[PDB]
Design an enzyme around this catalytic site. Structure first.
Site, PDB file in Angstrom:
ATOM      1  N   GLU A  70       0.843  -1.187   0.000  1.00 36.47           N
ATOM      2  CA  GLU A  70       0.000   0.000   0.000  1.00 36.47           C
ATOM      3  C   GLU A  70       0.883   1.244   0.000  1.00 36.47           C
ATOM      4  OE1 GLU A  70      -3.304  -0.269   2.559  1.00 36.47           O
ATOM      5  OE2 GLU A  70      -3.630  -2.359   1.963  1.00 36.47           O
ATOM      6  N   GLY A  71       0.481   2.217  -0.830  1.00 40.60           N
ATOM      7  CA  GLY A  71       1.185   3.486  -0.939  1.00 40.60           C
ATOM      8  C   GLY A  71       0.367   4.637  -0.351  1.00 40.60           C
ATOM      9  N   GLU A  72       0.598   5.845  -0.869  1.00 41.89           N
ATOM     10  CA  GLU A  72       0.008   7.055  -0.324  1.00 41.89           C
ATOM     11  C   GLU A  72      -1.499   7.170  -0.625  1.00 41.89           C
ATOM     12  OE1 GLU A  72      -0.870  10.204  -1.831  1.00 41.89           O
ATOM     13  OE2 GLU A  72      -1.407  10.935   0.176  1.00 41.89           O
TER      14      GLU A  72
ATOM     15  N   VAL B 220      -0.822  -1.261  -4.626  1.00 41.91           N
ATOM     16  CA  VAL B 220       0.077  -1.601  -5.720  1.00 41.91           C
ATOM     17  C   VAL B 220       0.092  -3.122  -5.844  1.00 41.91           C
ATOM     18  CG1 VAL B 220       2.403  -1.350  -6.657  1.00 41.91           C
ATOM     19  CG2 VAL B 220       1.545   0.369  -5.047  1.00 41.91           C
TER      20      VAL B 220
ATOM     21  N   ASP C 160       7.349  14.005  -1.260  1.00 39.81           N
ATOM     22  CA  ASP C 160       7.254  12.823  -0.402  1.00 39.81           C
ATOM     23  C   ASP C 160       8.493  11.951  -0.586  1.00 39.81           C
ATOM     24  OD1 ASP C 160       6.182  11.004   1.494  1.00 39.81           O
ATOM     25  OD2 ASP C 160       4.493  10.430   0.170  1.00 39.81           O
TER      26      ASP C 160
ATOM     27  N   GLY D 154      -3.496   4.267  -2.397  1.00 36.45           N
ATOM     28  CA  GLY D 154      -4.126   3.005  -2.766  1.00 36.45           C
ATOM     29  C   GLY D 154      -3.118   1.850  -2.818  1.00 36.45           C
TER      30      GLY D 154
ATOM     31  N   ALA E 270       9.656  -2.920 -10.112  1.00 35.30           N
ATOM     32  CA  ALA E 270      11.010  -2.920  -9.573  1.00 35.30           C
ATOM     33  C   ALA E 270      11.225  -4.242  -8.847  1.00 35.30           C
ATOM     34  CB  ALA E 270      11.202  -1.738  -8.649  1.00 35.30           C
TER      35      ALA E 270
ATOM     36  N   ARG F 181      10.962   4.732   1.487  1.00 35.11           N
ATOM     37  CA  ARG F 181       9.827   3.891   1.108  1.00 35.11           C
ATOM     38  C   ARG F 181       9.261   4.267  -0.258  1.00 35.11           C
ATOM     39  NH1 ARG F 181       8.226   7.764   4.744  1.00 35.11           N
ATOM     40  NH2 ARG F 181       7.010   9.225   3.500  1.00 35.11           N
ATOM     41  N   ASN F 182       9.672   5.421  -0.795  1.00 35.56           N
ATOM     42  CA  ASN F 182       9.168   5.980  -2.036  1.00 35.56           C
ATOM     43  C   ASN F 182      10.227   5.914  -3.143  1.00 35.56           C
ATOM     44  OD1 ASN F 182       6.629   6.396  -1.043  1.00 35.56           O
ATOM     45  ND2 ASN F 182       7.067   8.437  -0.252  1.00 35.56           N
TER      46      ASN F 182
ATOM     47  N   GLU G 150       6.207   0.679 -14.163  1.00 36.93           N
ATOM     48  CA  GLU G 150       7.341  -0.227 -14.202  1.00 36.93           C
ATOM     49  C   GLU G 150       7.436  -1.012 -12.891  1.00 36.93           C
ATOM     50  OE1 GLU G 150      10.880   2.223 -14.293  1.00 36.93           O
ATOM     51  OE2 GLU G 150      12.082   0.378 -14.558  1.00 36.93           O
TER      52      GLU G 150
ATOM     53  N   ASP H 193       6.054   7.122  -6.386  1.00 38.06           N
ATOM     54  CA  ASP H 193       5.003   7.711  -5.567  1.00 38.06           C
ATOM     55  C   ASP H 193       4.896   9.212  -5.793  1.00 38.06           C
ATOM     56  OD1 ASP H 193       6.033   5.105  -4.153  1.00 38.06           O
ATOM     57  OD2 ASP H 193       4.148   5.487  -3.092  1.00 38.06           O
TER      58      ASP H 193
END
Length: 295
Positions: A33-35, A39, A156, A37, A108, A160-161, A106, A174
């Site tokens: 989970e990101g900022e 992934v 941001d 929603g 990673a 983590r980003n 993309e 992000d």
């Protein structure tokens, strides 16, 4: 309002350069989970000229999404379409027409810089040297030079980003919070932001001002995360304490296994006066020097 306009815009704008047939996309496990929603890992058939399946990452809205999250998803779309740089995650496409909005980006191989470092150890588990670390920082710095030259603020920046791709190539990711500053070279927000306090510049925290130089501050925190192999900034200090701690000129102490040169760079990034902090070009120059001096 502003969002209903963008949603409508995004549904009507044909964009054959980005739109991708939902039929050719197959979704898999959640990568996290990101900022704004979720992934997920995915595979796309006949993506952008490539014959066969390409493995990709797909961003989508979590359950119970708010207008803020939807807005962030659309922002990230809008930004990634405009940028291309080897140290920025690549946008491949979107699906809008026949189900939930998805961005196709993309993949990673080594996930977040944060998780990659925490699964590692320094050598004088993965084995990383100070050279490795300076390399990572320099790649991020190069990406930021580019984004700053495009008149974008990331806002941001944090371990983590950053994504770690094949061959340990950093990719800034992000872009849900990133904003165009072409007009005035600053982004200002009346309401409270959604960037973690511990990564925010002092002017951002107090005055809600975001500039390339506030990105530079977050970069120094990022430098700290790298040099600590993914430590937690301001360990043990509650976020609310940062107002008083920063305004009285306190900063994080030199961590272990960190040169004077590297720490000096951190402190320069955290100067109270945004004009005194280095620019990314200066940062890249300082890192390159450390890299060659150590050989």
């Amino acid at each position: 309002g502003p969002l209903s306009l963008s949603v409508d815009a995004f549904k009507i704008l044909e964009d054959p350069k980005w739109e991708f047939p939902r039929k050719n996309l197959v979704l898999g496990k959640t990568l996290g989970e990101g900022e704004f929603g979720k992934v997920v890992k995915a595979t796309a058939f006949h993506l952008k000229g490539r014959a066969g399946y390409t493995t990709v990452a797909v961003k989508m809205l979590k359950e119970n999404a708010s207008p803020s999250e939807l807005r962030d998803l659309l922002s990230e779309f809008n930004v990634l379409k405009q940028v291309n740089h080897p140290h920025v995650i690549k946008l491949y496409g979107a699906c809008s027409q026949d189900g939930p909005l998805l961005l196709i980006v993309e993949y990673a191989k080594y996930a977040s810089l944060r998780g990659f470092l925490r699964e590692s150890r320094k050598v004088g588990e993965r084995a990383l040297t100070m050279g490795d670390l300076i390399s990572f920082a320099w790649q991020i710095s190069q990406g930021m030079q580019y984004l700053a030259e495009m008149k974008l603020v990331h806002r941001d920046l944090a371990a983590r980003n950053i994504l770690v791709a094949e061959g340990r190539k950093m990719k800034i990711s992000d872009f849900g919070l990133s904003r165009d500053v072409y007009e005035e070279d600053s982004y200002v927000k009346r309401s409270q932001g959604r960037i973690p306090v511990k990564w925010m510049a002092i002017e951002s925290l107090f005055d809600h001002i975001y500039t390339t130089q506030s990105d530079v501050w977050s970069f120094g925190v990022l430098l700290w995360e790298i040099v600590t192999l993914g430590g937690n900034p301001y360990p043990g200090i509650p976020p609310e304490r940062l107002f008083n701690l920063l305004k009285t000129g306190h900063r994080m102490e030199r961590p272990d296994n960190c040169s004077e040169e590297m720490y000096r760079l951190m402190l320069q990034c955290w100067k109270q006066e945004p004009d005194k902090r280095p620019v990314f070009a200066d940062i890249s120059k300082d890192l390159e020097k450390m890299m060659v001096k150590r050989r």
